[PDB]
């Protein structure tokens with residue numbers, strides 16, 4: 714879940 | 723501390739049928755991340771837990787929003803793109819029955835009781851802080867945050883609508899309907915992905 718994990722940061 | 727005013731601020735800060743549904747869902751997934759970051763203490767959870775909560779609840783979180791958005795729409799759903807879904811195109815998507823459930827179990831009941839935006843935001847925060855989400859590092863920490871949300875919700879309801887003593891429980895008791903509607907919507911979205919009707923290379927595809 715690279716996209717979700719990134720947007721959260 | 724979990725002030726309903728910040729939960730309202732989060733709401734106000736962000737707010738072919740299958741192709742229209744999928745495009746609007748992809749658009750709102752990005753919005754949903756911005757919304758969750760504005761819910762007090764969500765971004766203080768371990769990153770992996772934030773991932774787990776949004777993966778567990780994004781379907782119900784989007785349904786709750788488009789349902790409330792549609793309370794002044796005549797027999798249909800206003801998507802976040804500005805396009806509508808009416809009964810015909812719902813059947814064309816093979817989702818006629820679930821569409822009817824959204825209207826009778828969510829939109830019409832939100833309209834009837836005039837659910838306001840603080841209430842919607844708090845219901846959505848409860849959904850977000852789902853302590854049954856699988857693989858959380860400390861499920862009870864998420865339960866603790868859920869309990870602070872519904873404590874604040876109840877106090878808000880009792881202050882603003884004291885002539886409706888049953889209103890807090892009435893709000894909470896739309897969540898089983900949201901849960902089963904969210905399960906059925908996801909089963910169709912998975913089907914759309916399996917047959918190749920979903921835009922490829924999207925945030926939406928990762929969520930599925």
Ligand SMILES: O=C(O)CCNc1nc(C2CCC2)cc(N2CCCc3ccccc32)n1
Nearest residue numbers: 743746747750781784788801802817820907
């Ligand atoms: O536009 C927004 O606010 C968010 C994106 N729309 C949007 N999202 C979803 C999310 C819920 C998981 C996919 C579903 C959805 N529908 C529209 C009408 C009823 C229905 C029945 C079955 C399957 C999907 C749907 N529609």
